[PDB]
A paper describes a structure:
MPER bnAbs show outstanding breadth, neutralizing up to >98% primary isolates, but have uncommon features. Notably, long heavy complementarity-determining region (CDR) H3 loops with aromatic residues at the tip facilitate bnAb binding to the hydrophobic MPER and nearby membrane. DNA sequencing revealed PGZL1 was from subclass IgG1, whereas most MPER bnAbs are IgG3s.
The superposition of Cα atoms of the two PGZL1 variable domains yielded a root means square deviation (r.m.s.d.) of 0.6 Å. Except for CDRH3 where residues are displaced by up to ~ 4.8 Å (i.e., W99), bound and unbound Fabs show only minor differences in CDR loops. Similar to all MPER bnAbs, CDRH3 aromatics were crucial for HIV neutralization, but the observed pre-configuration of H4K3 to bind the MPER and lipid heads on the membrane may explain its faster on-rate compared with PGZL1, where reorientation of the CDRH3 is needed.
Numbering used by the authors:
A (entry chain L): 1 to 27, 27A, 28 to 213
B (entry chain H): 1 to 52, 52A, 53 to 82, 82A, 82B, 82C, 83 to 100, 100A, ...
The structure:
Amino acid sequence: DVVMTQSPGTLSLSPGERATLSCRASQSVSGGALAWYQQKPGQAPRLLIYDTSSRPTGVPGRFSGSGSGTDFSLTISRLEPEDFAVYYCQQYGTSQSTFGQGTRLEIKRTVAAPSVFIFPPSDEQLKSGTASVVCLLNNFYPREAKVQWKVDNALQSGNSQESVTEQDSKDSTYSLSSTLTLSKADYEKHKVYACEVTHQGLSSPVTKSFNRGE
Amino acid sequence: EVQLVQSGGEVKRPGSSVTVSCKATGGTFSTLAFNWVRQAPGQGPEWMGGIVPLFSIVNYGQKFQGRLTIRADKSTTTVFLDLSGLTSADTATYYCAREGEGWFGKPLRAFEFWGQGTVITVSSASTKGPSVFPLAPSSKGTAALGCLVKDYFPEPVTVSWNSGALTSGVHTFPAVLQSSGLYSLSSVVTVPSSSLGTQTYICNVNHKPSNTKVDKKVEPKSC
């Protein structure tokens, strides 16, 4: 099973800059059978390069591919706004083709620390028998952020989920929402609910908290 | 131009089989490979198998052998995927993709033409509208407020604020699938703290599969 490993996981670059994306195969790719695809949210992938270096009709000339053996590259000579997307390589030299895990190519902008907000569960929801506690991280960059939930000083694990917006089309930031879900009985057993946020734009972690029932 | 047009999305129960069709028009059909590729939410594409229609030579990914069938009709230029024994690991968008043609028609193997995708969700859940709970603005500049849209099935829900009048600063997050099999999402907006006493904020939630509309007023919590 040929394994395709792409680098970097996230490539952060400026509009108009040159971009170089890498792919490495765990064994030599037969007949230069290496393709690159671009994918935008909600759309099918689009073939940019096939057989290592050939462009299909309709693909702009700023895209080029090179490589041989186990190491391949996709180069974008200058990044137009439409080129920020996820890119996958694919080997198809064997009878079981495989894709790499993708490189997210996103817009680099000035570091922005998140604004952090914590929301207690509504009294209405508590009647359903469940408590959702929400932490919002608003308009931050870069995308990497760490959110830890602490209940009466105990780090929570296994009982939260999060999701992240697409990079904002006007300001190039991200936002993130993390939800801690507890039974009502567990929620009323504890007092202090806190979300602790670590991010490159914060000089030390930010904690937002509330005391149940106050 | 080559167009690949797929059949519609569906919810399927665990243990069932699903058939997806792909009508290919405008280009070579029988002597090129059509492939099925799927992509689960948040994951990369995965090739499943392919067919060359002329004599229906097929190639199936090893992990799908026994559950996957690929077929083709040459008179109606349509390819089919049949996938049996469905489980939640089969929830994905399924695409048909045709190989490109190169120098004097040479098959390129790379996937040049793609269908629009068919969204298949494998679940035992019944259609269910969301509850809507407020994310109330803190008493303790800029304030954040929102709505938590919880426990619905299937996707999607849409959220607007003040009937569309408020769009600046809104973030409506991707849904998460909870361990109960129901989805949940939040929608938030940041606004001037000075507006909290004078401006009404209402989130308008629509879940078309259950014909549910909810308008929830979100206000600072009293006391």
